[PDB]
Design a protein around this ligand. Structure first.
Ligand SMILES: CN[C@@H]1C[C@H]2O[C@@](C)([C@@H]1OC)n1c3ccccc3c3c4c(c5c6ccccc6n2c5c31)C(=O)N[C@@H]4O
Length: 277
């Protein structure tokens, strides 16, 4: 394998984002000119906050990801005080950004982008890994406009966690548990948000949001594409074992077979050219 890389091999640039225990900075490797998104974490802050298991799990899960719709971990290293993860750089940023720019997606884009996510989850769940905090802010877009799902610091590899309020599944609020269906629930929310322009469960604070979630309290606007609406209702189901896509419902075949995906060719999605937004 190559020599361990170090800080001096890069020319760090702008900050792409900040997390609670980390900072992601765009860096260009001097010897190759390649751009990487480097996640930086302070060893002391992690130990003081008892996050070692979390950072470790994050690195282990990312090291197993080998698919075009997911972030790729190219390398890691550390100096006396910090940990460095070398990640693939998704130049176009958050999907949420596009959602806001154009308000909402027409049908061709909703279908294309939902298909990529479904295809990514099928690959993720096939390795027995669950994200647990899937959302438009975590789904990035590469230079070609294909998705790049990242942020695995909250993943579970087949109850100690609750992601973003608006995307939390009901089982998480009434059992502290979570599984593949939790991601499918988040998927439903995301599909609803692509078509409507906003997530299904909204309210003044988290308590009120959690309240609507457990009572399955949301509704579709008049325009909502019929087939997408049907898919969403089969995803936003209170009983986790009744969601289209889960093992009890027989997996991904039935989900990918949904009428909404009728015209979709699942086989080579990352080869296809994305519809313009
Ligand atoms: C809430 N959105 C943030 C957007 C911004 O910073 C964050 C922290 C968040 O992306 C999920 N962020 C991460 C968090 C955890 C792991 C990896 C990343 C990451 C990558 C990237 C980016 C990024 C690229 C372009 C604009 C904003 C970006 N942000 C990130 C990243 C990236 O390109 N590769 C890493 O996966």
């Amino acid at each position: 394998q190559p020599r361990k890389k170090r800080p001096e091999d890069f020319k760090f640039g702008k900050i792409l984002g900040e997390g609670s225990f980390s900072t992601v900075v765009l860096a260009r490797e001097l010897a190759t000119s390649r751009e990487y998104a480097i996640k930086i974490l302070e060893k002391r802050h992690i130990i003081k906050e008892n996050k070692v298991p979390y950072v470790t799990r994050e690195r282990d899960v990312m090291s197993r990801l080998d698919h075009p719709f997911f972030v790729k971990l190219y390398f890691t290293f550390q100096d006396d005080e910090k940990l460095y993860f070398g990640l693939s750089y998704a130049k176009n940023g958050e999907l949420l950004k596009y959602i806001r720019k154009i308000g909402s997606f027409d049908e061709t884009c909703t279908r294309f982008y939902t298909a990529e996510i479904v295809s990514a989850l099928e690959y993720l769940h096939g390795k027995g890994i669950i994200h647990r905090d899937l959302k438009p802010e975590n789904i990035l877009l590469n230079e070609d406009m294909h998705i790049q799902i990242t942020d695995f610091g909250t993943a579970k590899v087949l109850n100690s966690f609750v992601g973003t309020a608006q995307y939390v599944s009901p089982e998480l609020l009434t059992e502290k548990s979570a599984c593949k269906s939790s991601d499918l629930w988040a998927l439903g929310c995301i599909i609803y948000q692509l078509v409507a322009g906003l997530p299904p469960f909204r309210a003044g604070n988290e308590y009120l949001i959690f309240q609507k979630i457990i009572k399955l309290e949301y509704d579709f606007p008049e325009k909502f594409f019929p087939k997408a609406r049907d898919l969403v209702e089969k995803l936003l189901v209170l009983d986790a074992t009744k969601r289209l896509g889960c093992e009890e419902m027989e997996g991904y075949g039935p989900l990918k077979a949904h009428p909404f995906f009728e015209s979709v060719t699942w086989e080579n999605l990352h080869q296809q050219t994305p519809p313009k937004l």
